[PDB]
Each structure stands twice: as C-alpha cells, then as structure tokens.
C-alpha cells in the first residue's frame, strides 16, 4: 500500500464545463533541436563567454538583450534621484 502510493495516479472527476488545455507558443514547435557536434548551430553564450576570457573574468552586459521601441537608447542611464524624493515614485503614464 506504500508502493501503491507511488503507483495509484489520481483522476480529476472533471468538475466543470470549462475546458483547460496546455499552451505551447508556436515558436517552440517551429524550433529545431539543438545539436552538440555541428558546423552550424547557435552560439549559446557560454561560447560567447569563451572567446574573451574564462568563466570568472567575463563581463556580461545585462542590457543589450531586451525590448524597447528604439535601440539607440538601449544603453541610457536611469537618473533614480533628484534633490529629494527619488524619481521612481513620480513617473507614470500621463
């Protein structure tokens, strides 16, 4: 009965009209399988890390991998303070 705890799966009893299905984004289904030994494959930023220094020395730009309407201000600096009353409390839409 203790091994039966690891055998007996449970059943939902189906308890609604509402239907609940798993979500897969279609770029996952469109995606090829990664292959370890291949002349052509994506870099996998381990290997971006590898060509300029080892493990502890490599400096990751946490930026340059995110979404904005203009790339030209991707590296700008949030001010985060003016005289009193830091800027994150004031900014909003409108």
């Amino acid at each position: 009965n203790n091994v039966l705890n690891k055998i007996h799966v449970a059943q939902p009893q189906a308890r609604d009209d509402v239907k609940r299905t798993p979500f897969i984004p279609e770029s996952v289904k469109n995606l090829k399988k990664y292959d370890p030994e291949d002349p052509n494959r994506r870099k996998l930023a381990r290997d971006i890390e590898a060509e300029n220094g080892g493990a502890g020395v490599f400096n990751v730009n946490l930026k340059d991998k995110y979404l904005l309407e203009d790339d030209e201000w991707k590296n700008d600096i949030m001010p985060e303070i003016l005289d009193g009353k830091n800027v994150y409390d004031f900014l909003d839409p409108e």
């Binding site: 009965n1 091994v3 039966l4 705890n5 690891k6 055998i7 007996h8 799966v9 449970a10 059943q11 939902p12 009893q13 189906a14 308890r15 609604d16 609940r20 299905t21 798993p22 979500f23 897969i24 984004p25 770029s27 996952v28 469109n30 995606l31 990664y34 994506r42 996998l44 930023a45 381990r46 890390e49 493990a55 502890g56 490599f58 990751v60 946490l62 991998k65 995110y66 979404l67 904005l68 949030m78 985060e80 830091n86 994150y88």
Partner: protein
C-alpha cells in the same frame, strides 16, 4: 527531461523559475546554467538573468504563470524595472506586499488553478486571482504547510511528495484537475517543488535524479509527443522495486 546542475547543487526550482512563456535564472559566477536553458528553450521565450532583493534564490521568492509574475516587497525598484524591460507586454508584473515574503513556497499554480498557504491574506488572494487570471484554493498537502515547496504543477499533470496519503491525492486532484503521483527527486528528497522546474513541454531537474525518477517525471507531465501517461502502468516494473 534534462538533467542540469546549478553550481554544485541539485536544487533547481530554488535557483530558477520556469513558466510556459518565460524563464528566470540567477546571475552567479558564470554562464553554464544559463546555457542549458538555451539548449532546450531556444530563442522562442525570453530567459532573464535577474536578482530578487539582491539575492540568488529567485525561484522561491517569485511566483507566477504565463500570464503574470509576482515579486515580493523587498524587490528593489531597479530590479522591478529590469524585469519589465526584458519581458513583453503580455505578462503582467506587479509587486505584492504581505506579511510573508517568499511567494514560491506559498503559491503553487498552473496556468489555470492556484493553491495558497492558509495564513495568506484575502487582500492578496484577490490580487492573485486578478493578476494571474486563475482560481485560488486554500489547502494543505498532507498537513504540510508550504504548498509550493512540496508540490510541482503544470497544465499536463502534478507531482507531490511521498508523504501524501492516497485519500489526500483523490481529494486534491479534483481541485487541480490534473493527475497526481507521489514521487521523489534527486535520490529521495522530499522537497519535490524545489528540486525541479516543469512547464507543459519541458522538465529540468538535478543530476542526482535517478533514471527510475525520470521515468515518473516523464510520464506524468507527458513529455514525449505520443505519451497519454498510461505508460506508467508499463513503467510499473520500475516502481515496485524503486
């Protein structure tokens, strides 16, 4: 069904968060753990190096599904700003204030049904249902108090820790509407939620997780494309011994 190790820890759900439309990883040291998510997920979903309150344990502080992401109170303004820059607009990102900080131990959920700690306040229970777009149920797994550490979910199925009674499994599956098996991960760890991460098409677990334990996990989440989970009866021969 991939084995992956953070620096030398078999614990993965502590150190990473994985939903259907994004993934969250820590920043410690070097990009070996980040690469293994790019081996599986590809470019299809954003994967984010982030810290929560200047820590590395980002899988137990946050909680969410493909619709929303919840961070605790101690998340600083820069780190809250950093999450929205990476993730697209389809996700809602909202800071939640409570008594208890760690939302990962307290909220276990799929895209559809959530479970909460009993001591959580109803002014957050309203916010959880509104942001994540899910139902909320107040329940304990086998009289253990943290439903996020001791249970792991997806839309496919659910996995619980082996102290769960069989009477407790039949009651609790009516709430989650998914099949439930008692199991262990990483050679007999009771903490099944922290050991692994799982979404509807991928499971990433520790290196210490044995091949009988991957057979249970690959079954209940139905990781191959032609698995109806009924092959656990075919895989019952592994279960009687192990």
């Amino acid at each position: 069904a991939t084995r992956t190790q953070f620096e030398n820890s078999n614990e993965i759900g502590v150190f990473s968060k994985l939903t259907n439309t994004y993934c969250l990883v820590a920043v410690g040291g070097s990009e070996n753990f980040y690469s293994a998510f790019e081996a599986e997920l590809g470019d299809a979903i954003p994967i984010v190096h982030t810290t929560i309150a200047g820590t590395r344990i980002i899988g137990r502080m946050t909680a969410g599904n493909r619709r929303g992401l919840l961070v605790p109170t101690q998340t600083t303004d820069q780190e809250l700003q950093h999450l929205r820059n990476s993730l697209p607009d389809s996700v809602k990102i909202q800071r939640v204030e409570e008594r208890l900080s760690a939302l990962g131990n307290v909220i276990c959920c799929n895209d559809y049904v959530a479970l909460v700690h009993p001591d959580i306040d109803r002014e957050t229970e309203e916010l959880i249902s509104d942001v994540l777009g899910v139902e909320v149920f107040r329940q304990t797994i086998s009289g253990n108090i943290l439903v996020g550490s001791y249970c792991s979910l997806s839309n496919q199925g659910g996995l619980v820790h082996p102290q769960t009674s069989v009477q407790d499994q039949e009651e609790l599956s009516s709430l989650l509407q998914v099949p439930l098996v008692a199991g262990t991960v990483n050679r007999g760890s009771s903490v099944v939620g922290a050991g692994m991460v799982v979404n509807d098409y991928l499971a990433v677990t520790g290196l210490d997780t044995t091949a009988p334990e991957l057979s249970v996990i690959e079954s209940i989440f139905r990781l191959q494309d032609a698995q109806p989970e009924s092959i656990s009866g075919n895989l019952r021969d592994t279960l009687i011994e192990t």
